[PDB]
Amino acid sequence: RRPARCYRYCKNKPYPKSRFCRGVPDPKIRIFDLGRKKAKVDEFPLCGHMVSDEYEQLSSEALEAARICANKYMVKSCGKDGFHIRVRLHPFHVNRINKMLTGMRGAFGKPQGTVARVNIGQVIMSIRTKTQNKEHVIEALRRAKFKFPGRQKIHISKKFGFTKFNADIFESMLAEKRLIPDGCGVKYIPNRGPLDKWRAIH
Amino acid sequence: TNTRGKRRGTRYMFSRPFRKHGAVPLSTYMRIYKKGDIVDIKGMGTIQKGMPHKCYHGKTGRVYNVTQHAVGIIVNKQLRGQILAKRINVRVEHIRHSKSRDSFLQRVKENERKKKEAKEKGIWVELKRQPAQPREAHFVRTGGVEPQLLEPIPYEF
Amino acid sequence: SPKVRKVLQLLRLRQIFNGTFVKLNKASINMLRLAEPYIAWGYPNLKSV
Amino acid sequence: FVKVVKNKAYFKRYQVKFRRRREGKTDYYARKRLVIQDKNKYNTPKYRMIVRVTNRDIICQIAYARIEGDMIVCAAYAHELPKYGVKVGLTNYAAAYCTGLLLARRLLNKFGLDKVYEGQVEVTGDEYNVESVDGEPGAFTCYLDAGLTRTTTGNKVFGALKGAVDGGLSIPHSTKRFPGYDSESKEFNAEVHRKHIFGLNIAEYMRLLIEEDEDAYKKQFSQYIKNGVAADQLEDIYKKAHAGIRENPVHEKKPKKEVKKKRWNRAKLSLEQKKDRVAQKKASFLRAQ
Amino acid sequence: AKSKNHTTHNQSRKWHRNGIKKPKSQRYESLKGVDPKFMRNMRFAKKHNKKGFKKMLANNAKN
Amino acid sequence: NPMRELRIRKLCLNICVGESGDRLTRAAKVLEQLTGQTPVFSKARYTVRSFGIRRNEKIAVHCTVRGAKAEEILEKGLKVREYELRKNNFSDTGNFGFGIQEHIDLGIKYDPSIGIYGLDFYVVLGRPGFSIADKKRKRGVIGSKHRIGKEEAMRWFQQKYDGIILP
RNA sequence: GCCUACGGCCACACCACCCUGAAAGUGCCUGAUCUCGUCUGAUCUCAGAAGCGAUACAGGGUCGGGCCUGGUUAGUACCUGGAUGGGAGACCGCCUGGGAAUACCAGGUGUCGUAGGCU
RNA sequence: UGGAGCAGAAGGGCAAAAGCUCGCUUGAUCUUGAUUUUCAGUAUGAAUACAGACCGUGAAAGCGGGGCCUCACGAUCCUUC
RNA sequence: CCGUCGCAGUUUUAUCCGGUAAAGCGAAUGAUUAGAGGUACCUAUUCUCAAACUUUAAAUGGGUAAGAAGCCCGGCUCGCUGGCUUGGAGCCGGGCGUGGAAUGCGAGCACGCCUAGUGGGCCACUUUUGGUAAGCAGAAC
Ligand SMILES: [Mg+2]
Ligand SMILES: [Mg+2]
Ligand SMILES: [Mg+2]
Ligand SMILES: [Mg+2]
Ligand SMILES: [Mg+2]
Ligand SMILES: [Mg+2]
Ligand SMILES: [Mg+2]
Ligand SMILES: [Mg+2]
Ligand SMILES: [Mg+2]
Ligand SMILES: [Mg+2]
Ligand SMILES: [Mg+2]
Secondary structure (H helix, E strand, O other), X not given: OOOHHHOOEOOOOOOOOOOOOOOOOOOOOOOOEXXXXXXXXXXXXXXXXXXXOOOEEEEHHHHHHHHHHHHHHHHHHHOOOOEEEEXXXXXXXXXXXXXXXXXXXXXXXXXEEEEEEOXXXXXXXXXXXXXXXXXXXXXXXXXXXXXXXXXXXXXXXXXXXXXXXXXXXXXHXXXXXXXXXXXXXXXXXXXXXXXHHHHHHO | OOOOOOOOOOOOOOOOOOOOOXXXXXXXXXXXXXXXXXXXEXXXXXXXXXXXXXXXXXXXXXXEEEEOOEEEEEEEEEXXXXXXXXXXXXXXXXXXXXXXHHHHHHHHHHHHHHHHHHHHHOOOOOOOOOXXXXXXXXXXXXXXXXXXXXXXXXXXX | OHHHHHHHHHOOOOOXXXXXXXXXXXXXXXXXXXXXXXXXXXXXXXXXX | OOOOOOOHHHXXXXXXXXXXXXXXXXXXXXXXXXXXXXXXXXXXXXXEEEEEEOOOOEEEEEEEOOOOXXXXXXXXXXXXXXXXXOOOXXXXXXXXXXXXXHHHHHHHHHHOOOOOOOOOOOOOOOOOOOXXXXXXXOOOEOOEXXXXXXXXXXXXXXXXXXXXXXXXOEOOOOXXXXXXXXXXXXXXXXXXXXXXXXXXXXXXXXXXXXXXXXXXXXXXXXXXXXXXXXXXXXXXXXXXXXHHHHHOOOOOXXXXXXOOOOOOOOOOOOHHHHHHHHHHHHHHHHHHO | OOOOOOOXXXXXXXXXXXXXXXXXXXXXXXXXXXOHHHXXXXXXXXXXXXXXXXXXXXXXHOO | OXXXXXXXXXXXXXXXXXXXXXXXXXXHHHHHHHHOOOOEXXXXXXXEOOOOEOOOOEEEEEEEEOOHHHHHHHHHHHHHOOOEEEHHHEOXXXXXXXXXXXXXXHOOOOOOOOOOOOEEEEEEEEOOOHHHHOOOOOOOOOOOOOOOOHHHHHHHHHHHOOOEEEO
């Protein structure tokens, strides 16, 4: 295919696979969660993200290659069931390609591939694991940067795993029955529902 | 090139608001529109008869003719360099009384009352509206407590 | 700009390096805001007047 | 299992109808065609006759629509007939004609048009339409608000209509829905209509029950016997009512009643009571464990 | 030998070259498109308006 | 209070024939002899090749009885069933029904002209006051503590007819 | 305090469930001779007043759903005008002004007019 | 709460409606002028609101001079009615 | 001359219009990831999106109004309107400038009458379409 230099910038409007854009091939990346996904929230407290710094288009080919490069290092350094990689960029923007060139007469091209439009400060790939595996996530996410264009920086989030709550408050909300784990994440329990649900918790 | 259809591009313009569908409320038909009053124009998709064109949506004009459940409006329409007084016929479901005109007629009723009440007392009151003047001088008490010191916060991720 | 060129005529500033006094109110400061790159105004004292 | 149709997203998108529609009282489709005045009339009142029949009472009103609500001009009820003689049977076609006649005579007495337009003092059940007199004030033009009733031949909404037209009201109508219109021959018989106006269809039923079974005659016409009303007295009872209505059509009410203003419903709980109720339930649940 | 299709680039300058002019507001605007039944009666109101000219002089004297 | 007594609102009989023609007009006379009233033909909603039915083609006949005649036809229907109904015959909405395989047991003598047909007896129960959800003026719901459940329907069948309900 | 008929605004009014309801009213309810309409007086129209508050209806309750209002998110995102600003670029900062919306949290939950009527 | 349908493409609109069914019908009729849209503010096409007739329908208020709205069409000359 | 008409590629005040940016999809349509609970679905959550999706929703922007062509008092005409001077519109007499936002400015005559040239454009900030891109092609200001 063409090099990623041709479809790196978000130059057109988002062109998703819809009833009007038919004939789109299947994306290269199909699995977004790797490792031990069916793990409790207390299993993997630490989480690290691959935050982007460019407003560009990451190809599904680069999303799959960076997924394998990060998985092959977490398996070799943290075991096959000691992490959970979640790719947080689904390729929805379809790329078009013109015919193998009467030159520009009817130049609207046919679908070529799919990219994921990333924003400045948006997470690309997230890895949660034990706290002592902090340096392994930084290196696993660093090796996957070379499989991506542009500039990305590795950030260790203050949240507890893949949840949206800080690690400092997570322990307190668990004791107060405000957070209950449901598989990979937790459910926020407000005080604004029927009281029967409150009796079931306690 | 685009099509010259009458309702081309009126997907959201003539559509009804969210949870505002159904039959038209009755007070819309109970409002009196005399000749010469300033009314707004806003097409309603519930009633397709007597529907104003997409150019007059959001426009304003005065009423010159009144018929059964329909009035005639003199609307200004700038085409290229000639603002044109258009005499259109729309039904009452697509018009509302301009509150700007009613707010001015109330200022006249008060101006005529103030200058009449001031003449009976001999005083002179003002009627001309004045823009927001620069704030006059004033004292600001600290209340004993010092002002809260602010400073830029450090950068976090 | 046409909007800037119209405000500069209402202030009688039709050429470079000319000055006119303006009675400051909300209807005037917003006119001075539409032409900030073209004007350099302030608050003159008595000696300046 | 089955998806909850009335889920959270159901009530978010759910647009309730009008209150009068949710209660099944106002037909808003026929209302805009009945109460809305032409825009070249400029606040000319468009009156209408509101005839409603409950299980025990017949409401006859005359109103015109306004933005702040309908303005009831005159109102006549079938429970006011005991003042004119009719004690029982306040929800029949003969009673509808009375409250309709009372509405037409009470309205004209309020506008002073009672001495100008009298309608048909003698009841014949035939087609009648009041005409305006030159030099005299115009006749009160009104329309019929039938409501949600199936307007078939014989509905009591056309009995009050006939009472209003005979009273002096100028209501456009026809003799097609009056009881006595043969749908096959397409002809209107006025003698059959006069029988329903004076309640002769009740007399033919009271006599038939006496000649068949007293046990059914007493079960069907208990209050007719309690008040002494017989079958041969029906036509003369309503005649004295039709005469007494035209004589004194004005309405008189009681001065006032000073009560203690006792509240009978339950007082709505405040915010402090709802919070404490939850805190007590939370304290009671953790205590039982 | 293609060319340009549509342009409104220099048109705003041409329109404002002489200024966008509104029609001069005239008292007693034209009564075109009014209700013909309304125009009939309004003509009769002016046709017989002199019929009460004597009552007008009598009422003005009372003031 | 007497305003909660379960009663028979209507008995709806159904004879769904596979096809129209002379086979269908015979079943119409069967309901006429039993219910004493003219039946109503039900056209097919859609077309089915396997069932051999075309759209808007009468395939069934149905009636409905309200007064004491509904209790008469139900008594003759429950007699053929030996006054016993399975527990699943009662719906959660308070109604129930059963099927008769031959109309000759209901009281209609067999004749060589018309064939033998099977009916579909369905009883719609109700309390006094269930008409508020059917009238046009001021229509309202029935209410939670007033609609018939499956338990009250089975108990009513075990009391008025003393029938046996199999598990 | 409450109920009718007609309404205006059309969820703060709806929905689920539970509790309570004087008096009148409303409704249920009782019948099919006439009016009228159905396969069937269930609906509809008509006739009536033995029965009760079961339901409808009204009021109240629910750490109720929704809805409504406000806070928060947030001067965040976005944006007018400006620069011989930065950067290979992608884009970003500043100047001049304008300024959001979810999640989250809190509060509220019909109201008004006309006429007649009950405590 | 329309998640169905409304002849068709799509959008909009629509629930005791504009959908479905039924019974009466021919406002899809005869006319004058004004107005809207494409516009040069010319024509055509298609629309809007009246008025004067003559009718339909409904108990009536009303509604209707084609299709729920946005497309579904044609100058001079000539022929024909 | 002040004053008053009249005027404006501009503000202010008052009041309308819109569905773009952004946002949302634990809200509808469409797309989409991973577990959990109850019994392949079903409930409660979770990841990522729309140009031909949207509950929300700007900035900029569009329309109107800011008086004598008015206000107030008293009458007249009508064949329209009609329970009733009841509307409506027109007309007549009398009374009342504090001209009833800021600023600038002379306007009007369908911006009169006749009228040449032009009807190959091109470029830049921003917005934006096709195209890998183009000293490319095509738009808005
Ligand atoms: Mg197109
Ligand atoms: Mg060219
Ligand atoms: Mg071309
Ligand atoms: Mg709640
Ligand atoms: Mg909020
Ligand atoms: Mg006509
Ligand atoms: Mg020229
Ligand atoms: Mg030329
Ligand atoms: Mg050339
Ligand atoms: Mg170019
Ligand atoms: Mg070129």
